[PDB]
């Protein structure tokens, strides 16, 4: 089976760092936010990012080995978790702020601009503080994003596990090479995986938020964004 199962931890990391999508800039500059202008800004950015995301998924070892149907199902199920972790990751060096784009750094308050938005902002920020605190590494980050893509919809399914194990192997390798003890390795591996179920949770609230914003007719009906939204 899969060629991904015969990569060395270092090859694996290399593949993942390679597949990284570009960091998009917001295609408008706020400069007073408004519920409709804010949702159009964030939503505009997300829609674009989804195109690059699809390209990225095709480069994660073992992903393309799945059927078109399973591939579709995996992305529909994790697109937001993936947008979110990408967000928290680049927001690491910006205490109390969310760096949606190099040219769009918002903070908790501007989150008040939209209904039921601040809570989600706070959760994201908490995740970002946690990663900062843990001194998450880029090599670790791309392993986490891949575990999310592959692990999110697998039991909502009704090879993947082999690839997940491989990725766990890689994370331990990174941790070992960094000098952590066997105990510190397991603990950190657990701490990172645990943060994942929180990102899952933020994703669920996010879906509900995005869906309500649609009802309120505040969000521009982007084709791909909506399809992903309806998937659930």
């Amino acid at each position: 089976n899969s060629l991904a199962l015969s990569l060395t931890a270092d090859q694996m990391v290399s593949a993942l760092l390679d597949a990284e999508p570009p960091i998009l800039y917001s295609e408008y500059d706020p400069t007073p936010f408004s519920e409709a202008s804010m949702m159009g800004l964030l939503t505009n950015l997300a829609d674009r990012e989804l195109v690059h995301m699809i390209n990225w998924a095709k480069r994660v070892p073992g992903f393309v080995d799945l059927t078109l149907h399973d591939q579709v199902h995996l992305l529909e199920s994790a697109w937001l978790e993936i947008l979110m972790i990408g967000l928290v990751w680049r927001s690491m060096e910006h205490p109390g702020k969310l760096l949606f784009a190099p040219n769009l750094l918002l903070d908790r308050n501007q989150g008040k601009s939209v209904e039921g938005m601040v809570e989600i902002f706070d959760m994201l920020l908490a995740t970002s503080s946690r990663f900062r605190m843990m001194n998450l590494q880029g090599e670790e980050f791309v392993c986490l994003k891949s575990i999310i893509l592959l692990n999110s919809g697998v039991y909502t399914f009704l090879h993947i596990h082999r690839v997940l194990d491989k990725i766990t192997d890689t994370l331990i390798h990174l941790m070992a090479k960094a000098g952590l003890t066997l105990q510190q390795q397991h603990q950190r591996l657990a701490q990172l995986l645990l943060i994942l179920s929180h990102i899952r949770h933020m994703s669920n609230k996010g879906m509900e938020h995005l869906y309500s914003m649609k009802s309120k007719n505040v969000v521009p009906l982007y084709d791909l964004l909506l399809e992903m939204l309806d998937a659930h």
């Binding site: 195109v51 699809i54 998924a57 095709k58 078109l68 579709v72 992305l75 529909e76 791909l224 399809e227």
Partner: peptide, 9 residues
Amino acid sequence: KXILCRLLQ
């Protein structure tokens, strides 16, 4: 509707 299966194509 369907856009995803095509992009992955």
